[PDB]
């Protein structure tokens, strides 16, 4: 395997753009952690028991399952977004050629 191209994403140090990009990746990771914490709190304290039609608690119960997916879905999705941004903005760009020998 030969790496024909390998350069750092930020050759010029001490730039405001690099600090801005560092915060952007962190913000998505912080959002994922906040959503994951919300999933822990929602799953433990939100009213989940089924309520019969015409009851006072029917509306709150109807949002139990939707809140479970919103907090769980947004948490791991935000972590994935931050991981993609880190690769595309901080992990050095490389081009590698490998002989097949097939």
């Amino acid at each position: 395997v030969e790496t024909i191209f390998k350069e750092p994403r930020w050759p010029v140090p001490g730039t405001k753009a690099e600090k801005r990009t560092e915060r952007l990746v962190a913000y998505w990771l912080m959002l994922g952690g906040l959503s994951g914490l919300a999933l822990l709190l929602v799953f433990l304290f939100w009213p989940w028991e089924y309520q019969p039609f015409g009851s006072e608690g029917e509306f709150l119960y109807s949002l139990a399952t939707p809140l479970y997916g919103l907090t769980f879905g947004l948490s791991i999705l935000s972590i994935g977004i931050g991981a993609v941004l880190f690769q595309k903005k901080f992990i050095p760009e490389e081009i590698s050629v490998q002989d097949r020998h097939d």
Binding site: Y50, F53, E58, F59, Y61, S62, T65, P66, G69
Partner: peptide, 8 residues
């Protein structure tokens, strides 16, 4: 008719 959906 007026029971909201439970799974979203």
């Amino acid at each position: 008719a007026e029971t909201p959906s439970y799974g979203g």
